[PDB]
Symmetry: D2
């Protein structure tokens, strides 16, 4: 029954929304992102989620390294937390645990981690990494996560895994706080891992009924393991003063595609339907809160403008609706 | 470039050496970096460690710490220590490149081949043979140079593979590659792929022999390498006070045994600022281009160095400028 | 083309046909006599199976390479195809061990490269489970390493899975060990069309096999590579057509049986005359070898060489 | 008990710098009739000219004998324990439990470099070998073996069928890492050839280490045996070897059969349980050993 938390996609990779050639006032540079992070902190966003890439993709020509970029965004803010994306394979838990702990010490305990298991083989092939089977990649990520928790929590951590080994490893200093572990993915392997070792699980964008079904499945598995997991939903937010204007922006995205079902195949956040007036979006967010959603991961076309707009128009309405819901229960 | 460059050991790990007014914390090191920049130091060299013990109970991660020190300075260059094994070149190349973009191209790299097998075993890494570790480090260095300067980089090594890898964005500048080690494998690698080579602390005559050997190997490979020397600087107003500080170090740990832990004492940069300045210029005459300085009390002695020892070095360099 | 060659599944793993509870051994004594009977029956190749952990159909398993050496030592002209599984196997050891056995057996050893089907077997032995197409990339580098080691001195190979640096294997094989390979996926038939000498196609009808043969030969021609084709088949040869159809009924639905053993789809069930006619019919669509599986190996293999195989030779003489 | 005897199988060319199968098949049969119990193969991958693969050669030598035991040489690295355990178990079933294993930690980096293997540090190669040995014992003895090592992992691995017997594990090496590993996991330890006084010191050291681990290990010594009818002829062979240019020479098993038999029993008194014999002409001197030297050793044992 706690307040809904909000996070935004850090555009630390170029291209933005690569499937549409619509003009976007978004940049991947540090100066743009420093201002965006400060705007997001002032707007009421709690988390900033970075993206991890090594090779250029179909539309994303430049990518800042996620961990170094997370440290830079943290140094430009005061209370905003930044989720550093980690890709097992090119990343190893020993370095990831120690680097995230140091950054946590330098930023007053405001760093989190998002473990991505990888979807594109070409990124691994370019950097000399082998391409493991789909479920096998999640076995390795689960050992990666358990290593992070053990290294961060024990004086003499020992782990005898199929992918990672530790023998009386002592990390000092440890994180100031307990870095939260975010994780996405929609496959059975992804939600079996989240139901065991993850703090946050990003469920795929869907309708209110579909998201409720995804929430019930993950909580049922988590309860069987006696594990607690909070749930966030990915959403592409188009907030305008009029419903027609917001629906016109969605039309321009499809019209300048490089159908509506094609956007879902690339970005599931459109199915969340956070498109319309600020009052409509706030009502749908609270409706998602009723089915178990604890966090909204927002994507925007013009990040600096729409994040500021979100904090002045949509977020206050969400808080007012939350107080209204809280007052009716008592 | 003709003037002798100066660098200091960043105390990003606890313990110092075998009472010290130094700290491994960020607040102490931010001030120390700013003091070192104003004192005339050009480089800051971090240390890399993974597990607690082996002398250092507390250890900050070198690359992130390098990013923090760079953000607190304007012209200071920071050398990030990298250890092949727990580190892989693809992540190292991309992380250092982004930090280079965020810090106006002021980051360098020091490739360490590792000394404690217990630290490797604790993190699940196998312990390769001595010369084999330098073969892996050399492939690590070649991958960094290739990734940072060309698109579609391809490398088929025994330790690392790359297949048409294009890193974007690339470093703003060209990160210099520093490297130490005194074994034959260490200086054969430096004479091929390294920009800077740290030679062990020794007498003026011994350092000249080490400089002549490394430059001969580099010339045979058609490779250019600059030379720095490690030194533990104890600068006091009187020679007796400096030798008394050295005595307190030995009595709270012999001199020969002290060298086996830190070779910087053999450089003999102990004494008055005039004595130290003369010995620094004498090393410049045998081919030394940089002095890597270690201190007992970093914040105080760095500031003392920039006000007392460094100006005397510049004056002695200008005296020979007329020739 | 040439005379149709025949091969049989070596039952070096227990269980036999696990899909059926019909009474039907994996010991060395049963297999030494089986190899000699197959050699006298006219079989040219013996195909071993590779397994590492107990379960997944076979509770007891003999090591394929050592078992191949034993069958070769008990015969004179029979060729044995040793099954090799990249992962637990490495090309350097495989190349040297098969070369020594080839020297000791007058060049009668071959190799069948298996890409693995059960991830539980790999996980039990500490091996990582690569993606499906990625496993075939490793198997191809495994095959290229064998060919280079067996044929060249100072071999150098810079692969993503295997490396060789100025390696010279001595002694080399007496002959050129043929490389057999199965698999039906796109990656399996792209690898076979490049580096494999023999390709095992899945059991199917005469029309379906012709389509599979044309596709693989078209890919092989594009690579300027020659590949011979064999087909897996479960042969039930009886004196009467009713008796042969009764054995299939006793084993059994039929569609579920094909999912376990695709050799039943080849439909080599019936009288020796019917089977011999279908074998020559398969030869017309490009089949060069028949991989035969049996319920009672010792009895049916000798029966095959006395009843079915002579008819195949007689039918080939007529045409 | 009775002193056991083994001979170096010349399955690699050069001898003491024939290697063919037909030569070694008859030599194995001659050695079995002469009273030798073990045959020790050598493992090589690269020319140093022609080397037979040790395990396949071991299977061939066993098939040519009835009771002779053959020790197959295994090199961790190019060999992995899962394949080694299963292959030796199958050969054990096919040869009436007459297969043994010699775990070699490797001495030449060029052999590993040619086959794509990394060159680990000296003591690190012995740590991997000890995990290799523990994996062999566990796979051969348990229904569901699990091992979480730094070099090898196993998760509920079930080998069926298991070896008919219990394959003995032989191991040499003289470094501290070599005899610390032998004192824990090895059945037999080959000590370097030396004098009777030096061998006793080596035997006492290894048995002291084995007692601390509560482990039992038998001891063999490498020796190059040159047995001739007269002492002068044996000393002439040694001169011809040196003039036309191996720790086994320090054992000093050179001379008449009576002198060698007396020295063998003296080695038995200091803890030696096996003699690893090297010869100049294998097919000839092995037959001579079994007819002239070995019976005298047995006679000296009966008197004791």
């Amino acid at each position: 029954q706690q307040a809904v938390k909000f996070a935004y996609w850090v555009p630390n990779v170029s291209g933005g929304l690569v499937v549409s050639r619509i003009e976007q006032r978004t940049d991947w540079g540090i100066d743009y992102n420093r201002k965006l992070a400060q705007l997001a902190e002032a707007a009421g966003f709690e988390y900033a989620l970075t993206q991890i890439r090594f090779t250029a993709g179909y539309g994303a020509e430049f990518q800042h390294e996620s961990v170094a970029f997370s440290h830079a965004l943290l140094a430009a803010t005061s209370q905003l937390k930044v989720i550093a994306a980690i890709l097992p394979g090119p990343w190893q838990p020993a370095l990831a645990a120690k680097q995230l702990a140091t950054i946590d010490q330098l930023t007053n305990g405001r760093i989190a981690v998002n473990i991505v298991s990888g979807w594109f083989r070409g990124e691994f092939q370019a950097i000399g990494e082998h391409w493991l089977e789909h479920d096998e990649r999640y076995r390795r990520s689960e050992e990666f996560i358990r290593s992070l928790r053990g290294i961060w929590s024990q004086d003499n951590f020992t782990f005898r895994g199929d992918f990672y080994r530790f023998d009386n490893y002592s990390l000092k200093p440890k994180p100031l706080g307990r870095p939260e572990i975010f994780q996405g993915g929609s496959s059975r392997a992804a939600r079996d891992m989240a139901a065991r070792v993850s703090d946050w699980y990003f469920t795929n964008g869907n309708s209110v009924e579909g998201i409720k079904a995804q929430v019930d499945d993950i909580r049922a598995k988590a309860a069987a393991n006696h594990h607690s997991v909070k749930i966030g939903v990915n959403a592409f937010v188009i907030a305008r003063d009029t419903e027609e204007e917001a629906k016109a922006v969605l039309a321009q995205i499809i019209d300048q595609a490089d159908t509506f079902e094609d956007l879902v195949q690339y970005n599931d956040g459109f199915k969340t339907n956070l498109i319309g007036t600020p009052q409509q979006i706030a009502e749908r967010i609270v409706a998602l809160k009723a089915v178990g959603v604890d966090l909204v991961l927002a994507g925007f076309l013009h990040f600096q403008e729409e994040v500021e707009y979100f904090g002045q128009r949509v977020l206050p309405l969400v808080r007012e609706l939350e107080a209204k819901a809280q007052s009716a229960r008592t």
